[model samples]
Target: GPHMRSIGTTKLRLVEFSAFLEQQRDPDSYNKHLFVHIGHPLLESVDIRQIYDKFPEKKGGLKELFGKGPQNAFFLVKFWADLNCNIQGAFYGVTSQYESSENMTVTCSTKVCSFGKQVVEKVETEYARFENGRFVYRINRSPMCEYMINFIHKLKHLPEKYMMNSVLENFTILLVVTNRDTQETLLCMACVFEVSNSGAQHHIYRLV
Candidate 1:
């Protein structure tokens, strides 16, 4: 059982709400809020890239998981299929609309089934600016969690030994999912993966 708030519409604790406010004012407090909110290690020992990289390229690569289309959604459905099918399930897809060419944005919905029990629906918006080599998705409406997930990747031009060719550094696909209005983190999955010649170091955690 968990503490219920917002007159029964939201499930959040007092301290959790406080930290959510802190996140809005001070975005850098993510790590600190993570520690305070989840009561767990900031970086858990897990490698999602092991499953992520092995994603089937029947159509394309990981980049297909994002952007303005339903293809990413189909990819995610299959991507989750590789894992335990009976335990957890997820569905990510989008009905995209373009705004000019240079300045474009899109909105979509996500459906996730947890433990073969509850099905959660989420609304997501993407400020798709490919020029910056980073994709930012904002999930802050009609859901129990409200937060931003960042996907960053680019060609490596550094002189470091391990850092060669290309890599996605500190790429946090999804962190904490909290409600901006009620400030309730219904579910959390923080996966920080850094690709290199040596190996793909990652920390994955799920706290609810």
Candidate 2:
């Protein structure tokens, strides 16, 4: 019953906060928005303060800053129902932070792998690289994130297939966004596998 009760409280808080955010007209003006999505519920209760303290100072101080902002400044919270529910992670980005944008190209060959030949040459040839100096992208304060191709495919389809019956081909995309002021680069990599029959796909994306 403890687990159910914990989840119930979390769900209640999530619903209340989401309603509050929805009512706010200027949610974007806040300095930070910490979104927590729990895909799998935690078996044990953990102090929010303790978790916040684990993050580096650059990430932000929870004790000093939590719930200190105006109605528009509060962090958004979300919860999902499922046996496996836990926070995926947190990401912070400034909207419209980029100055001027340019595209850079990255190449990954399927030369060593068998599925490389199946991928369309154009998808491999033309990849968009975000080259805006002013933009700052971060994920949980870890750098050198791994971006996978399967994650992108899941964006369009749900219940994604990471291998698609072991028939689909695998691809990779690496995106590195740099913050000019801080000199911090947010690197994201995606390992994508696409299925031709079910049109299912899987992507594993990471940021560091």
Candidate 3:
């Protein structure tokens, strides 16, 4: 209730900004973005996590996936319906102002988890650590992750240049992006995360 970056309305602010940004071609977004953090124990080793904090989980699905720019002080919370995968979460970079209290309009159209309507789901695996970490990347393992992997996979066909999975075992920072128009979310940015066995590691995050 306290960390509101704006005094009036977060949604209205985002809505208004949406128009302005679209016109000026601002290059970056100041609008609200949502984030759903899965199991906490898994993120502990991610020593290089950008600014974030946990928020209360809600019942409805949020709007967008991903975009982060200049403003980097993040505090967070929440999760939501069908595939909102209402579990736990917090704010990230641009999402800090979208706290549940803000009740901002969710822009995400693709529901990652539909619970009953949809039996399977896979999240984008985009998490990492700045210290000692490890992983065995497998796209077929999580439906949520698979969705993201496949999206990126299909977008570009570059043989081994666009390797198939995220196998992390190092300090990293993952960045996901959303198409405001298509609502298509995918891992857009990530740093080096390697496995000990020489297996290449990556992170964006595949959530349940």
Candidate 4:
């Protein structure tokens, strides 16, 4: 589970908490957070660019699944019917997913967090989901393992500048690992973002 250090109620309907984050933000000619943290999620919108980036003719040291495209790997997630459903392991949508370099900045709309322009491709599991929301949902460990492996590969090779400028690079990916366990359980997660001015691996780990 997430080891959150909070100042108020930890639970709030998606948009509400995002609003809190926005209100707390410091904006004095700066880009500090992900657009999604203060904006609303585009539940039905589709970004297929990442899906095509999956099949690159040249492969690398990292292990990638043979999905349509790694960028849009989770775009095909099907279980989501609407925003009204409520159940464990079942989520509504991506909070602030980062992909390329641009997503790291903060962009907003009427105080609601707008969608990010990055492809922080993540699949709690490479094989993705299966069954009645168990395997991919929460009960199964396959997706968690897959997500962890993929996360390590990306962090190992990619840099922080290459990161989509959401709120924080290396930040959410590390926090997300908690989804693998019951809420409140603390687990050592992947990486936290530390960008470079110019380099092969733009972002490296910042262990605290």
Candidate 5:
């Protein structure tokens, strides 16, 4: 889906292909292309300390630290996880490079009332199994639906006071939504990570 291009012409595609090949021929071109193509630098000059200073109440608090909201939203968590996962030793002893865990689910609502949970569960299970293991990497609509269902379920269980926080934590679900004629699908990708052990740490990440 991310690879879907708005314009696909024979000449344009060929020219793009040639440019792609040129990068392979030139090392600087490779670096330049990568640097230019990858939008948003993974790391900025902003200090982590300064960022934390903006939220002093969260300091030294585990639940508060990990709790969700606009500030500590799910997307931020995913980005953090992705960045760390990309690091050389960040995933050591935690994530196996050869394995992956992912799931997808979809939901449909009728005019009378929304569909039952059983239907959602069935769809998610089938999608998860279908995309469990594969060399080709692409987010499917079914998985996106599953993510939305998981998000709503998590939200329903949260207390009113922590509603925003719960929403932030479950941001992963919001990220994986796909709409069909009458149904919605969500895609989710889950992976493990290694956490530093200076204090209590949980080294698991699950997306459902």
Candidate 6:
């Protein structure tokens, strides 16, 4: 308990500026556009070669066959659901389309593994939307859940024009966990997914 409080305090301070930023938005804007990292990773020539040389086990060799944004958003939803499933031990539910027509949500009977045992949580993903280059979503649950808190998650898909090559695609996934009442962040993390001509890779970095 002591360690968690101290850790929370440290991360709270790290995201202090954003608490101020939370209020500076236009009155009509309810979304919290948070980005743990400003930009995508720059890979070396050797790294590019390594990525290009290796092929995934799937039947189809990797190719930049799709460029549509909505399909990418759906894939991202399943990816997040699976990631969250592992993070929270396990969950029972299916992903579904929500408001804004194209938005996604996962309402699950989740296990709060960090909270000792036999604890069940009503973990619901809500208010998710996908734009041309951005996808935003929120996980709605108790504030004192002990593990994943309620907050907005943003995934910024880097335009191919900005990437090193047309075959190399990247999406920066940013997570900000906050105190629902105070609106101060308790934890922050960022992860990057690199999709190359041969395969894909996930790079995770915790900001706390």
Q: Which candidate is the best by lDDT?
A: 1
The residue-level lDDT of candidate 5 at 206 comes to: 25
Q: Single out the weakest 10-residue window by summed lDDT for candidate 3.
A: 13-22
Better of 2 and 3 by TM-score: 2
Cα error, candidate 1, residue 115 (Å) = 1.9
Worst 10 residues of 6 by lDDT: 69-78
Candidate 4 regions exceeding 4 Å error are 1-44, 47-140, 143-159, 163-208
Ten residues in sequence with the least summed lDDT for candidate 2: 11-20
Per-model CA lDDT versus the true structure: 0.26, 0.24, 0.23, 0.24, 0.22, 0.25
Runs in model 2 lying further than 4 Å from the true structure: 1-170, 196-208
Q: What would you estimate as the lDDT of candidate 2? A: 0.24
lDDT tens digits by residue: candidate 3, 1-208 = 1222222221111110010001112456333222222222121122222321111113322212223321221112112201111222222211111112221122322223222132223233222222223211211212233443343334234233223223221122333333344434322222232222221222232121
Considering TM-score, where higher is better, how would the candidates rank from best to worst? Answer: 1, 6, 2, 3, 5, 4
Across 1-208, the per-residue lDDT of candidate 4 in tens digits comes to 2122212221111121110011222444322222122223123323333323322223420122222212211222211011111122111223322222111121111101112222234334212233443222221111223343343334434344345333232232212212222222111112223333332121111111
List the lowest-lDDT window of 10 residues for candidate 5. Answer: 12-21
Per-residue lDDT over 1-208 for candidate 5, one digit per residue giving the tens place of the 0 to 100 score? 0121122111000001000001233444322111001012021122223222222233322124234212211111222211111111011111001111333232222110121111222221222233345321222222223433353344445445245343343232112222233232222212112222132122212211
Better of 4 and 5 by lDDT: 4
Clash totals in order: 6, 27, 40, 31, 11, 0
Q: What's the lDDT of the predicted structure labeled candidate 1?
A: 0.26
In candidate 3, how many Å is residue 12 off? 16
